[model samples]
Target: EPKKEEKKDKEVVIGEKIISDKMEITINNIEFSYDVLPKVKESLYTHYPAESGKVYIDIAADIKNTQKQELNCSDLLTIEANYNDGYKYSSQTIVEDETTGFTYDNISSIDPLETKGVRFIIDCPDEVKTSDKPVILSFTFDGNKYVYKMK
Candidate 1:
């Protein structure tokens, strides 16, 4: 939303957990490409292409509801991506695919003590897909920032 001092943010990686009072989030994996991956089933869903000069970034994650009540993902997390360039890009799409069958758009609620898989698609500059530097996924929850670098 605004410029943040990233030095205060928590740095994590794929499979690491970001725990809060309400939930725990873990980024499982990330996929980057100029083109979207094929759907596991043709009947599943349609994925649109990225705009010109941009690439598609797909991420798979798990959100575990720690509280005794159901939780909504949107209320618990805000997500963005960057190439360490300081310009952050918000998630462009909630995705569902082979890698992320139980994604955020497909399943928005996490039952108490339950964990659910989620996916996000971020449209980034074409160079990001092939950049030598790492792509960063920043997640905001409970007023704290957790970052994961995809290398």
Candidate 2:
């Protein structure tokens, strides 16, 4: 006889931590933060704001290297997010806000027990509706995909 695997809910809120096998990841918060950067150009002429209707979606999270030695964050990690209903959302070109975050290329060399965060912004469409189904965040690592249901 074969055994059936039980389904578990790994639901977490902002400011909480969720950890699994190879590495531990934290989702600090998710917010609709900014519209665009403030201009510093000292010109009398007016310039149009390129990112007018778009919203900057910020997702703050932490990734720790729990390996025995050094590990590249890219070698065994994947972050994928999508809405459960309403519409489909694809990941865009995400840029680290300042000098206090991680990216795909940088922070490649991670030491054991070292924890780093990658808080980035995405120019998201204003179709941020939820609850009809829900938002899903999937983080893959250590040969397993950890799924989370967001409120």
Candidate 3:
């Protein structure tokens, strides 16, 4: 028998927690950056600058691994951002802490039962970011799509 699809879509509130199967996700905030230029560089990870005529949609979420093994964030959930234009797929895992003047990318793995903060970056056109339109964020996990709208 197939499972019923109910309550898959929801309006997300910041700092509110949502549980899906073996993972708990909470959206801390959504921010935009015209340029993703890293001031502080690390030897291990390289930060790539944002593409020309594009904007980076930063999704800051705290994810907890509810299982016993290591969990790759991308494997468990997928996120997309859309405004006036269609949806843009998630491009990179990033860390944008402007207060600390630090930026990094490609951080997504989570240890067992560990809660970690991650930023998912969506590369979209500059016009989309400048339009001041409400952007819709869709998070898909366990075959359910939960949406959040942001200005």
Candidate 4:
């Protein structure tokens, strides 16, 4: 006599999972005048799967009574991602205009207090697994700090 064997069905989860958040910062007394600086900061999060995909960063703000501001793609903004205390990764300076879709590496200058955005694509290493760890994104504006998380 022989015994019969049974097979069980399996389950799988696919696609990417994203988590996001935002923060607001106010800068007071930029000119150190009797009045206050009254600047508002907007922060955002962008996450990508380790398998590889595209990520976008958007900026929004209102500069009251301030001159019309603009942030062209060539602005000197630095982007960095950290996986561990000692390791770091960064992207080259990006320059592109959201309105005209024009791109340039070097430009004369960008308007102040501008509302703009940029997108980046990261080809994550195939060897890295989902359980590897979470990454930290740090954005700096004129030496100030804005941070976000990605896993």
Candidate with maximal lDDT: 1
Please rank every candidate by lDDT, starting with the best. 1, 3, 2, 4
Q: How far off is residue 99 in model 2, in Å? A: 5.1
Model 1 per-residue lDDT at 48? 52
In the order shown, the candidates' Cα RMSDs to the true structure are: 4.7, 6.7, 5.0, 19.7
- TM-score against native, each model: 0.71, 0.57, 0.72, 0.39
Backbone clashes under 3 angstroms, per model:
0, 0, 0, 4
Off by over 4 Å in 3: 1-8, 36-45, 85-91, 94-108
Report lDDT per candidate: 0.69, 0.51, 0.69, 0.34
Q: Write the per-residue lDDT of candidate 3 for residues 1-151, one digit (tens) a residue.
A: 9988556477778899988778998888777886554434444434445688988887777788899888875564456887765756564665434344344433446789988666677888877678876688887666667887766
> Per-residue lDDT of 1-151 in model 4, one digit per residue for the tens?
7998674422111221111122222211111011111122233322222323322222212111123544344544454555555346664432334333433335633455442333332233322124367566565653345555544
Q: Clashes in model 3: which pairs?
A: none
What TM-score quantifies how close candidate 1 is to the native fold? 0.71
Locate the minimum summed-lDDT window of 10 residues in model 3. 97-106
Ranking by TM-score: 3, 1, 2, 4
Highest TM-score: give the candidate number: 3
Supply candidate 3's per-residue lDDT for 89.
56
Give the Å shift of residue 66 in candidate 1.
Answer: 1.6
